[PDB]
Structure 1
Amino acid sequence: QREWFANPRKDVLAGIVVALALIPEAIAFSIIAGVDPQVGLYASFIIALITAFLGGRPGMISAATGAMALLMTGLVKDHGIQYLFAATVLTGVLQVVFGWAKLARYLKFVPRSVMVGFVNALAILIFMAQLPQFVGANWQMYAMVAAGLAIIYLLPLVFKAMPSALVAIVVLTVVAVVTGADVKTVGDMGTLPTALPHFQFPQVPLTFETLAIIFPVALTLSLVGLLESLLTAQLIDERTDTTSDKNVESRGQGVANIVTGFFGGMAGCAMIGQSMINVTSGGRGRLSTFVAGAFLMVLILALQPLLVQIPMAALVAVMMVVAISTFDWGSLRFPKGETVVMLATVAVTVFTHDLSLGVLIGVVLSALFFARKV
């Protein structure tokens, strides 16, 4: 059976840390995808749980990332936050289908140009998503986001193994509350969780015509999620040692997303950064991810009235730096076609504000170049 409970002392702690790092991610990504923070937090929780029990690679955090959100942001403003639920259920179904058929090894065939393009487009789309918080501008917004970047970039050279983003959020919250600053707070953008996720059958989609409109986004969500899970897995593999079956990982991902969709949640996948922060801080057990999700839920339920008071400048700063962390690649001075693919995805996503379209043209372009090679 090979199932363990080794190193609880470090796993629990690591889970706590990455949970504290997980809250603002889910809230923000929820706002970016035009939906309530509740959906993102729920998603992170239940996904972390189910992956903790059925995941392939232990110590890998699967919660809620922009890589999923920016693919649903178009589905929510055209059909609603609930066609999203259907799409997440179907996504999980496609993932357990992908795992049952044992097709993970084919993920290598996916062009690097398409992937790097996806990453770039993703990041700059994050940065662009932070812009509608500046169109209605009070100088408190500017001052607190600038001081946010400042404290995030200048404090950690003096401090230790505790996030500068944590200090940023806490300090800016305390300030905004005490000084009574006039700025938008998170509680305005959407409702925050006040109870446990209840079984919400997607009462909002209807069979076939729904299928015809959620199948593409479920496909892209599934593929992106399995890619993310694959690379995150392999990086944890390199960091330590494992013979992790990526098929089992894909299945766990699938089931997770399925029940997530059945409990009023978003779509989720593996998170590189938080998995790395986890393994670096001593997390290498399933209890790490479990405690991540659980302590996430407990803490967001605990700080709820304080949570809704958190100023939007702090979170827009955190997103502002997560974008920067995501984008920067090797801007090479190389195959013209591949560069063409990356820049195509980037430019198309930038112009249309649709990540799915960038992915689509990436796929078809890579296919054309392939036909030209073959």
Structure 2
Amino acid sequence: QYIVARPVYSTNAFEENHKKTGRHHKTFLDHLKVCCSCSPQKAKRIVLSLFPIASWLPAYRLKEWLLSDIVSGISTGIVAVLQGLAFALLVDIPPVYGLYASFFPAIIYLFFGTSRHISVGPFPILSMMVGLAVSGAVSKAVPSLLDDERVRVAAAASVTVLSGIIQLAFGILRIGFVVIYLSESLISGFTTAAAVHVLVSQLKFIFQLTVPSHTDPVSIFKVLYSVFSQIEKTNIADLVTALIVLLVVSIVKEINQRFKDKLPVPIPIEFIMTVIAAGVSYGCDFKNRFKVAVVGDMNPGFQPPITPDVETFQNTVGDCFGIAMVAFAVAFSVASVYSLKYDYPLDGNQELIALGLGNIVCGVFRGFAGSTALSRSAVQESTGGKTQIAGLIGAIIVLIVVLAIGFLLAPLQKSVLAALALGNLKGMLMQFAEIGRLWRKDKYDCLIWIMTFIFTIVLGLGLGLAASVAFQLLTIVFRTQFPKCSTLANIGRTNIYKNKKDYYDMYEPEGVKIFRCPSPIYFANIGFFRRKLIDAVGFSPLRILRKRNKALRKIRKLQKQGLLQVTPKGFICTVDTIKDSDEELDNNQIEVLDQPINTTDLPFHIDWNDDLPLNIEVPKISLHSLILDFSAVSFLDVSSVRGLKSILQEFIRIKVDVYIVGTDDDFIEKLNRYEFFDGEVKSSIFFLTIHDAVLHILMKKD
């Protein structure tokens, strides 16, 4: 049974009886000393962290990893070639830049990356964010089809170079923990909005229509209007072939997911349908019989590096910041699943550095933004990916496609790629069945999800992330704005104290009120806390103090006039009744009422609760003690400290004690720094538990 027999402590007798260890908190001088303390072991650790390949490559097991890595690399290389060709169209650049952006960051990540399963390249969200950034940049540059494509390519290279520089700077600064400011609900809402954006954007390629590059403020609706204002000019053959490809891919993906145990090395539907479509377009000549747009004959080989444009750097700072943040968050979210699945450590700063270097190299070599895509990562993992050697094999396949087999993929329909991209939208769009779950569960994360979706949809991907982050930060204040403050009472004559309106046989101590605030008190909570405390107490301590001071001043004036003769016990009051001549105070003297009462000159100790001569109101209070249950109060910063000090001073000045209960050692240590304690609000008002506070009150009363 719960049996305890201990003395009553007040967080000061406790410390006096039990000696503390006197731990030395770390200062700032020694923080820099240990950082600059260079040692060979720490240097080797830093070098190995910066070059994870030097650690994971010599530990390769070339007996059970080589074949699986090779197969997974071939599969992911085919998928990466197809996905780069598809996503190069979203930026509205020649397709070969998609291959470049699928090749270069993977090669850089093979050296500088810490994850072992993700595949680096383009994914639709980042691709369209880069495209929007390019459209914004080329619309602000100070003043043919070939020239427009070249300027778009240059703008994309500059934007992705700046994004890689930002990512590398973030990784160097060791601030790679910024991924925790994005809630799971915010991630879900943003991903669903981006999925809708992808579905809207791929329509102009499915229908084979010319759509101008729109601007960030309202992009999806403008694109939809532009697409549906020319719906008559659609290509029926292109539309039907896109539908067939999408239907076949979705059906095969469904059967592949359903039949997993019986199906090793899952069917490469992307490759199979792509080669089928290319063979159908060839021979049958799906470029003159119909007017289907096809992927042009890409130049076999790479391209010389270019210097990024400082004008674009200046123009698209915010867009590049958003691109870097989105890429890092997506990469971390994708890599964390496989890291937890296969039990290896993940380094956020190393991931940021690798992504930044890869993006920088890709932009220097005329590419665009690169990260890991969920579809490609899942393909690589399911095929049997064990290390980044699969990524190297995929890069080799991409290089082979770029160099040798370049005449192929030319009869490609330039919209089978769009249908393949839309085939990856099923998992993204299935997240729409989350509003109901969040509404049933939280009712606040549902608000976060809805607001994030609306903000992204009506503001573009670049600004929706910032707006959603701001609203998600505000939702914490929403949570801790109106805490369910309640009065506590004893249950069963034990040390159990719960809500006053919950149980039946409870009992409160005579003239004792226990108040609990089940939320941290900060700038947005001090006023509500004070109002709730005053309402629970039942009177205003400031009002009581002011009325008592007015009564004392009237009594002193009467004594000066001689109507009141002071005696050791009682007042003579040699007047039956006065005409009740009240006195008013001017504007600059009303402060004196708030001053504490000191009746040392009067030998009689005024009770302020029984009766006053000459019929003075002086409202009485039956509350002779107050206990604050600061057990759930995590922190106070400035305004809460000032409000608490004012409330405690007002309470103490009317001859009632205040006790703070439930705070640990750290809370009182922090409060000591705020100059909270003084000659009035001593440090002995803190008690361990409500029962100790109540027992101390009872002991001091009788």
Checking the alignment, whether the CA contact within 8 Å between 2:133 and 2:320 is kept in structure 1 is no
Superposition misfits of 4+ residues, deviation over 4 angstroms: none
Per-residue CA deviation, residues 162-184 of structure 1 (Å, 9 max, x unaligned), is 22222221112211223223143
Looking at structure 2, the residues matched to 301 and 253 of structure 1 have their Cα atoms a distance apart, in angstroms, of: 25
Match of 1:139 among 206, 230, 236: 236
1:61 touches 1:274 (CA, 8 Å); kept in 2? yes
> 1:1-374 to 2 correspondence within 5 Å?
1-4=54-57, 5-6=60-61, 7-78=65-136, 79=138, 80-133=152-205, 134=207, 135=231, 136-155=233-252, 157=255, 161-181=266-286, 182-188=290-296, 192-202=298-308, 205-206=309-310, 210-329=312-431, 330-333=433-436, 334=439, 335-351=442-458, 354-373=460-479
Shift of 1:310: 0.5
Distance apart, 1:337 and its partner CA? 4.1
* Deviation per residue, 1:37-61 (Å, 9 max, x gap): 1222101100000001110112321
Q: Distance in 2 between matches of 1:120 and 1:155?
A: 23
Q: Which moved more, 1:41-50 or 1:151-160?
A: 151-160
Q: What is the Cα deviation at residue 155 of structure 1?
A: 4.3
**Contact 1:86 1:261 survives alignment (8 Å):** yes
- Asked if structure 2 preserves the Cα contact closer than 8 Å seen for 1:229 and 1:250, the reply is no
For residues 356 and 370 of structure 2, the distance between their equivalents in structure 1, rounded to whole angstroms, comes to: 10
Q: Separation in 2 of the partners of 1:65 and 1:155? A: 22
Deviation at residue 348 of structure 1 after TM alignment: 4.1
Number of residues of Structure 1 aligned to a counterpart in Structure 2: 367
Native 8 Å contact 2:87 2:124 kept in 1 = yes
Cα deviation, 1:285-320, whole Å, max 9, x if unaligned, reads 121111111211212433322212101342122122
| TM-fit CA distance, 1:228 | 1.4
Looking at both structures, which has the greater relative contact order when contacts are Cα pairs under 8 Å and sequence separation is at least 6? 1
Q: Shift in Å at residue 272 of structure 1?
A: 2.1
* Structure 1 residue 199: Cα displacement: 2.0
Instruction: Name the Cα RMSD after superposition.
Output: 2.2
Q: Distance in 1 between matches of 2:451 and 2:153?
A: 29
Higher strand share: 2
Q: When the two structures are superposed, what TM-score results if normalisation uses the length of structure 1? A: 0.90
Asked if the contact 2:455/2:468 (under 8 Å) is kept, the reply is: no
Deviations 1:148-197 (A, max 9, x none): 12322344648952222222211122112232231434425xx6352024
Q: Which residue does the alignment assign to 2:648?
A: none
- Per-residue Cα deviation, 1:48-94 (whole angstroms, up to 9, x for no partner): 00001110112321111112111112222232332322221121122
Report which stretch shifted further, 259-268 or 96-105.
96-105
The alpha-carbon distance between structure 1 residues 357 and 184, as it changes in their structure 2 partners (threshold 3 A), is farther
8 A Cα contact 1:183 1:312, kept in partner:
no
> Aligned equivalents of 1:153 and 1:86: distance in 2?
36
Give the AA of the match of 1:341. Answer: I
In 2, Cα distance between the equivalents of 1:106 and 1:150? 39
TM-score scaled to structure 2, two decimals?
Answer: 0.50
Residues 111-150 of structure 1 deviation map (CA, whole Å, 9 limit, x = unaligned)? 2232112211111111111211324422212321222123
SS of equivalent residue, structure 2 residue 55 = coil
Amino acid at match of 1:173: A
Q: Aligned residue for 2:523?
A: none
- Is 1:199–1:263's contact at 8 Å kept on the other side of the alignment? yes
Q: Which structure has the greater CA radius of gyration?
A: 2
The verdict on how the C-alpha distance between 1:81 and 1:117 changes in structure 2, with shifts beyond 3 A counting, is farther
1:4-61 superposed Cα distances (whole Å, 9 cap, x missing partner): 2432222122111011111121112111122221222101100000001110112321
Give the structure with the higher percent helix. Answer: 1
How far apart are residue 351 of structure 1 and its match?
4.3
1:356 is displaced (CA, Å) by 1.1
Superposed CA deviations along residues 191-232 of structure 1, whole A, max 9, x for unmatched, are: 635202432222xx23xx543322111111111111112112
Gaps of 5+ in 2: 1-53, 139-151, 208-230, 481-702
Amino acid at match of 2:95: P
Contact 1:43–1:63 under 8 Å retained in 2: yes
Q: Deviations over 1:253-273 (max 9, x none)?
A: 111111111111100112222
| Mapped partners of 1:303, 1:245: distance in 2 | 37
User: Quick check: 295-304 or 56-65, which moved more?
Assistant: 295-304
| Counterpart residue identity of residue 292, structure 1 | G
Deviates more, 1:289-298 or 1:300-309: 300-309
Looking at structure 1, the residues matched to 343 and 171 of structure 2 have their Cα atoms a distance apart, in angstroms, of 22
Q: Which runs of 5+ in 1 are unaligned?
A: none
Q: 1:344·1:358 contact (CA, 8 Å) conserved in 2?
A: no
Report the 3-state secondary structure (helix = DSSP H, G, I; strand = E; otherwise coil) of the residue aligned with 1:307.
coil
What percent of counterpart residues are identical? 20
Identify if the C-alpha distance between structure 1 residues 164 and 226 changes in structure 2 by more than 3 Å, giving closer, same or farther.
same
Q: 1:18 touches 1:292 (CA, 8 Å); kept in 2?
A: yes
Letter in 2 for 1:3: W
Of residues 309-318 and 152-161 in structure 1, the stretch that sits farther from structure 2 once superposed is: 152-161
Contact 2:159 2:312 in 1 (8 A): no
